[PDB]
Design a protein around this ligand. Sequence first.
Ligand SMILES: [Ca+2]
Ligand SMILES: [Ca+2]
Ligand SMILES: [Ca+2]
Ligand SMILES: [Ca+2]
Ligand SMILES: [Ca+2]
Ligand SMILES: [Ca+2]
Lengths: 171, 169
Amino acid sequence: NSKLKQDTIDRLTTDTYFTEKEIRQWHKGFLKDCPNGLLTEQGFIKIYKQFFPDGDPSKFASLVFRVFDENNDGAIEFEEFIRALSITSRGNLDEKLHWAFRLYDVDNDGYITREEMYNIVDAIYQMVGQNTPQKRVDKIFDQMDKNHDDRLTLEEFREGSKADPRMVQAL
Amino acid sequence: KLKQDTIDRLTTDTYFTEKEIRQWHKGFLKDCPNGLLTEQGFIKIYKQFFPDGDPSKFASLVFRVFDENNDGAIEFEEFIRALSITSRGNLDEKLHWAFRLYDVDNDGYITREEMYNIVDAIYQMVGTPQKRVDKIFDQMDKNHDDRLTLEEFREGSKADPRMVQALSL
Ligand SMILES: [Ca+2]
Ligand SMILES: [Ca+2]
Ligand SMILES: [Ca+2]
Ligand SMILES: [Ca+2]
Ligand SMILES: [Ca+2]
Ligand SMILES: [Ca+2]
């Protein structure tokens, strides 16, 4: 059933930054675009092509699709689409870096490895054209990997990702 | 002067860690022996970020929102609470802070002159100008009374990010 149910709205308004009025209007758009209520991977990548016309965004969009597809059934339902957008577009910085941690930790083992990291950084370079991804990976691990075990925990990744505020740096 | 008393209120109310708070305190004291950051000291900070311009006007407006107690100085606790919001807050929290920045007389409404003043201050730091503002202002201005409530400013900003972003600096 493709109808937005009230029980979906109640969990969404409880967990997300959106109001019911926003959810119901977003839902009419989502339905227009996705008549059976399911956003597919091809459809998702197509959105990334719109945002990034002059690279190949497909690798990165596939990685993001999998994080949006929380129940791993190969589709993004509406509730999934909204939960993800709430965090990324209205979340505080910790909520966003936690979502981003899930993006990198592709096997969900609780760590970002050097390989998982190279893979994201390579996907982003493919999405926008212009020294190597390998050098960026070494640099991130140099600052962020405090116990030198070639992996990043959520705390290391989140705290490393969090810059000192510009004003603090200035002092 | 780091009352552990203070660190607790700070970790409880901000997105900062004890570690972070204790470290940055050291930087604060080095800069302001007093424990008190003055307005012209604050301006110097922005001048590091924006060397081409004159940042005095923007920094002054910002300075007043940091200085929650209206006593003319930014104490460490004021400094970290303002920073927690602008550097780590959610969209609503940032939007509320931007509203205090735009609302220069703190009357709970933003006027069109108030918006001109902040945009002009940005142009001075960073660099027709009214009309642009006049149009955004006019879109946000839902019941058309020529003043923006917070609600009007928030929702207006979920469509018109440019005013808040500008605050970003
Ligand atoms: Ca799914
Ligand atoms: Ca992993
Ligand atoms: Ca590690
Ligand atoms: Ca004060
Ligand atoms: Ca006002
Ligand atoms: Ca109005």
